């Protein structure tokens, strides 16, 4: 309940001119008070129009400002020019930074003046520096300066925080003021004209530095931030890698004194096992070399901190190491040229001097894995393999982006990259030939996208024609079905939907065991991803062809084999100025349907071969092998306790055996912990890097500034949970900057706290960190209803596309492939489903989003005169709130701390009620209807759509299922079985869990079925209304958990809900009309 005050103070700060006026708008559910609100708003508008002060009106309508709820603030300012520089000159007292132009290997990566890199405006490109975020550097400077003004007169540790941040911002502000604040355009891009005489990386460096300095609280924070901010001005390439390198060894220096053990996808059983860390001298030499590299780059504080920690190598002081690791990733992205990044990726030294025996065994293992994955569906004539083309057509929405093509629908021309629209266009023009896989050779080389992650090297992505996806979809789906129940495939293994996000490596860690872990992210152009890998897959397909008598399955396998054959001899396109390089590339890359599963298969085969060779010199049992995306790790158990020499010998043997196959591996062997891309374990504890950048983005998103503010808050929450706390006031300042909309060049509307924190499509953040927003008061229900009224919007582009003959022809072909002939009713439902699937196209979704935002803005400019009987979640909670009695309770701490970087209050919740055991899926995946849908298409209807559908008539449900692509017989079986009667409860559970973010943020870490938690909830059971009991119990759990989060203490809840109230609420529980913005989903794991 602080956002509105901070907003008003920020408006005063940024519009300190004497002509600046803030007009606060209010709303109320009470008609008597709403009339006063309307009169107050009218009088404020009239006074501003006549230019009269509004102070007296705050006395005339002091009840409105008291009893009504603030809806927004209208700001009128007329002196906006050169305001940020006027504020900044105060903080530019320090010495500006001078870039070292001999730090980066590539010339254009040195932070020199833009003219020195792009002599003419035609040569200029901001792609190598673009923050790719819809917020300006001027806004970041304004937010930092507002924070400094607000906290200028703090005392105690607050004053120390202010002083540290003032020093860091003095650095940043002096550097920026030396050249002047560059001005963004409407697209938040920085043009050549405003960047000629500035350092090229000034804007992105300034954004990263502002984030870092606003993330500083302690002295160690200040030292790390100062070092990184000063060094990243000159270093743009190797700084993050330099700082993150030691961690891969540090995890191996901490003994385990008790640890966690994964059971099923989030369930941990805890061990009191003690394991000593066995570290050979070579590892210490490597760590010494890493620290020497740090110092050679100008680092003094970070290596000194690491050396100080190395005195004891204790897990209690390891949080500083985790802090350095997380901070390393906030020096921004490395958006080097596609040519250099690709050439780094496809830098290969292929040799004929490889071990033929090893390669033949590896190929045989790949063949065996493919056969194991696809034997049963191939032998039994699985429907998906019989209708592979139809399955691919139905699942096109889940395909990767193609290369942009000029499509025409009706009389409109578009430039979609969506493969479904490409299929539509080709069908309309007689170019749809699934049976032919286009070559990807020097005649039609593959265009390349890029995936960039801070610290990590850039990855190339194939952009293939849609025929590859059509050919590969069904086979890869069968592969994923197999891999979901295979524990070795960490990326895919899951009992229902959730992955082993904590990993499974600590179960077999012992004093007779060692864990070998290897980074394999650089094995895209390795010699083992060449002909051997593709030919192993081809041999598997050839074997599978003999196991089936269905011509359609054989044709599916033939098309998959043809895709592999074509990809064996493939070329890639890379632009370079005015010349396109066609580079031979017969290796693996993402952007193909099978890439993830195929990489897992190949890595498993390769590690099996390597371990087979390593068994020559040592006797051990391989306990587990896990291939988790960019990393692999295997646990080897020995008949003796592990010694230093054993660890060193195993590491050397693994490296040499991988080299025998021409694979360059840095084989890291430990006894106590590992470090992989998505987590690292040290001292029996698990850590996740908190490197999500806030003021910089990898690439320009297809969202709005509103949704980007929501994503900014979500990223801030995820970073905070992982141990990287940015000041919440700075985040709220950014939120108010990004959610404001210009009614005119002089008038700007700032939404209030209620607007932004309310559960709706417009939700951006929560008033309290880690607590889902809900409220039982009349105003909150009223505004939720009003916002729900604005959710439904149309798209003109979607309408024109759906009305075009191209879309109608596509729907007709889809229907005839679905065994319907001029049905006239089924076809219309299929057309609706395909029009919905068109929502993945960025212009359509953006048009809908902007329509919603515009409607919201029109509503916000006036007091909300909207009333409806529509039921929202706040209505349910208001109904059930009065019957809950609250008492003070106590829970002892009886659960282990396994995530040391969790915030203290979240950690308290975990210690008191425990961590999540098993997760109820948020999409209703384990409902009969959802399983039926997944049987034919990977398209996932939103849980809201399923919630609406499951309460319709039987024929309506049947028609919806047929539209999704389920055959009529199966849909009629589902409906006539009356299975929807049981399915509606699972659907309601998933719907409510989605609305209340039970599977997001900190809630995903909690156990909502904890015996300790349910010991605090006392709801006498009344049967035969499961929906009401479910919502009552979930609400009680949320209330208790949120109270503990906010206060750090516990409350018991008691609700003797009357039966009549239960029956009344039962009717409403199936008519809930509520939404929550997906942009507010804070996924702790990513």
């Amino acid at each position: 309940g602080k956002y509105n005050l901070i907003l008003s103070e920020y408006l005063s700060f940024i519009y300190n001119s004497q002509s600046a006026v803030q007009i606060p708008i209010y709303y109320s559910s009470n008609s008597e008070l709403e009339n006063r609100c309307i009169e107050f708003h009218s009088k404020c508008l009239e006074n501003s129009k006549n230019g009269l002060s509004l102070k007296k009106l705050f006395v005339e309508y002091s009840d409105v400002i008291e009893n009504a709820t603030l809806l927004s603030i209208l700001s009128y300012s007329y002196d906006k020019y050169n305001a940020v520089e006027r504020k900044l000159v105060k903080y530019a007292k320090g010495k500006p930074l001078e870039a070292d132009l001999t730090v980066n290997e590539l010339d254009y990566e040195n932070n020199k003046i833009t003219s020195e890199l792009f002599p003419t405006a035609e040569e200029y490109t901001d792609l190598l520096m673009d923050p790719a975020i819809l917020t300006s550097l001027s806004s970041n400077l304004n937010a930092v300066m507002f924070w400094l003004e607000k906290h200028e007169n703090d005392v105690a540790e607050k004053l120390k925080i202010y002083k540290r941040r003032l020093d860091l911002f003095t650095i940043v502000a002096s550097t920026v003021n030396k050249y002047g604040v560059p001005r963004h355009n409407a697209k938040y891009r920085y043009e050549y004209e405003v960047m000629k005489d500035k350092p090229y990386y000034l804007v992105t460096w300034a954004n990263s530095s502002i984030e870092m300095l606003m993330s500083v609280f302690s002295h160690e924070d200040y030292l790390i931030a100062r070092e990184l901010i000063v060094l990243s001005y000159s270093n743009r390439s190797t700084l993050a890698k330099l700082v993150s390198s030691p961690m891969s060894i540090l995890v191996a220096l901490v003994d385990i004194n008790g640890t966690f053990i994964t059971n099923e996808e989030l369930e941990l059983e805890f061990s009191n096992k003690y394991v000593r860390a066995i570290v050979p001298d070579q590892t210490f030499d490597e760590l010494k070399q890493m620290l020497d590299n740090m110092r050679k780059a100008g680092l003094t504080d970070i290596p000194k901190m690491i050396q100080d920690w190395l005195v004891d190598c204790s897990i209690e002081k390891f949080p500083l190491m985790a802090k350095i690791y997380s901070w390393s990733f906030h020096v921004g992205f490395r958006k080097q040229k596609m040519l250099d990044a690709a050439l780094d990726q496809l830098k290969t030294e292929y040799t004929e001097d490889v071990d033929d025996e090893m390669y033949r065994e590896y190929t045989m293992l790949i063949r065996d894995e493919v056969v194991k994955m696809l034997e049963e569906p191939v032998k039994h004539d699985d429907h998906l393999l019989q209708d592979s083309e139809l399955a691919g057509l139905l699942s096109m929405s889940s395909a990767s982006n193609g290369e942009s093509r000029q499509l025409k629908f009706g009389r409109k021309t578009i430039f979609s990259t969506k493969k479904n629209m490409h299929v539509m266009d080709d069908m309309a023009n007689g170019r749809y030939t699934p049976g032919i896989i286009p070559p990807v050779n020097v005649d039609k080389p593959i265009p390349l996208g890029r995936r960039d992650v801070p610290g990590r090297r850039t990855r190339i992505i194939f952009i293939l024609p849609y025929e590859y996806f059509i050919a590969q979809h069904a086979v890869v789906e069968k592969m994923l079905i197999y891999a979901k129940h295979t524990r070795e495939y960490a990326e895919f293994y899951s009992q229902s939907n959730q992955l082993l996000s904590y990993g499974d490596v600590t179960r077999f860690l012992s004093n007779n065991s060692m864990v070998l872990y290897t980074d394999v992210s650089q094995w895209d152009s390795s010699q083992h991803n060449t002909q051997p890998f593709r030919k192993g897959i081809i041999m598997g397909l050839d074997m599978l062809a003999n196991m089936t008598n269905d011509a359609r399955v054989i044709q599916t396998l033939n098309l998959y084999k043809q895709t592999q054959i074509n990809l064996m001899d493939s070329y890639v396109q890379i632009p370079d100025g005015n010349v396109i390089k066609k580079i031979q590339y017969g290796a693996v890359a993402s952007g193909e349907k099978q890439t993830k599963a195929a990489n897992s298969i190949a890595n498993l085969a390769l590690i099996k071969t390597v371990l087979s060779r390593i068994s020559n010199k040592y006797s051990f049992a391989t306990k587990i092998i896990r291939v988790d995306g960019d990393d692999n790790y295997a646990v080897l158990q020995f008949n003796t306790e592990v010694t230093k020499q054993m660890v060193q010998d195993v590491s050397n043997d693994v490296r040499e055996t991988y080299a025998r196959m021409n694979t360059k591996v840095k084989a890291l062997v430990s006894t106590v912990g590992i470090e992989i891309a998505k987590r690292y374990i040290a001292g029996g504890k698990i850590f996740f890097r908190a490197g999500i950048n806030l003021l910089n983005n990898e690439k320009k998103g297809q969202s709005t500034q509103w949704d980007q503010a929501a994503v900014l808050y979500s990223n801030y929450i995820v970073n905070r949970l992982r141990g990287f706390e940015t000041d919440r006031e700075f985040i709220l300042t950014k939120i108010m900057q990004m959610t404001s909309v210009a009614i005119t060049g002089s008038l700007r509307l700032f939404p209030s706290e209620r607007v932004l924190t309310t559960n709706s499509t417009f939700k951006v953040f929560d008033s309290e960190d880690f607590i889902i927003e809900y409220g039982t008061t009349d105003d909150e229900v009223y505004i939720q209803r009003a916002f729900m009224s604005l959710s439904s919007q149309k798209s003109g582009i979607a309408d024109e596309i759906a009305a075009s003959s191209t879309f109608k022809n596509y729907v007709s072909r889809l229907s005839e492939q679905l065994l319907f002939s001029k049905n006239n009713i089924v076809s219309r439902g299929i057309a609706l489903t395909e029009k919905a699937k068109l929502n993945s196209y960025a212009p359509i979704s953006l048009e809908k989003r902007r329509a919603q935002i515009s409607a919201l803005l029109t509503m916000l400019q006036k007091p909300v005169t909207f009333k409806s009987s529509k039921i929202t979640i706040n209505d349910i909670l208001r109904d059930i709130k009065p019957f809950f009695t609250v008492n003070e309770a106590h829970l002892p701490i009886q659960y282990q701390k396994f995530m040391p970087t969790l915030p203290d209050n979240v950690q308290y919740i975990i210690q008191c009620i425990g961590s999540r055991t098993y997760q109820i899926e948020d999409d209703g995946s384990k409902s009969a209807i959802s399983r039926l849908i997944s049987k034919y298409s990977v398209y996932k209807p939103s849980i809201e759509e399923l919630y609406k559908v499951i309460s319709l008539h039987e024929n309506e449900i049947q028609l919806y299922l047929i539209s999704l692509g389920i055959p009529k017989i199966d849909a009629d079986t589902y409906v006539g079985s009356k299975i929807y009667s049981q399915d509606k409860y699972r659907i309601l559970e998933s719907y409510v869990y989605n609305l209340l973010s039970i599977n997001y943020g900190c809630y995903q870490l909690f156990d909502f079925n904890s015996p300790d938690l349910e010991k605090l909830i006392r709801i006498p059971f009344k049967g035969k209304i499961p929906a009401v009991t479910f919502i009552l119990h979930l609400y009680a759990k949320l209330e208790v958990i949120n109270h503990a989060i906010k206060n750090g203490s516990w409350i018991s809840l008691f609700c003797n809900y009357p039966k009549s109230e239960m029956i009344k609420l039962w009717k409403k529980m199936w008519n809930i009309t509520s939404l929550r913005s997906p942009y507010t989903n804070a996924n702790f794991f990513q």
Binding site: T885, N887, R1018, I1019, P1020, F1021, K1022, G1023, K1024, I1025, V1028, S1052, F1054, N1056, K1059, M1062, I1063, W1066
Partner: protein, 50 residues
Amino acid sequence: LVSTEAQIQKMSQDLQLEALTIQSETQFLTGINSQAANDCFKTLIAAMLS
């Protein structure tokens, strides 16, 4: 005294209450609170004494 909330929950478990059925057992939990228990104790002993 035994917690009123815990005792009410225990009794409701023992009674198998159904929200969609009108039952006599719904009244069994009527007026169960510690204040009433103390009032009964005091009333009985005081009435016998006086």
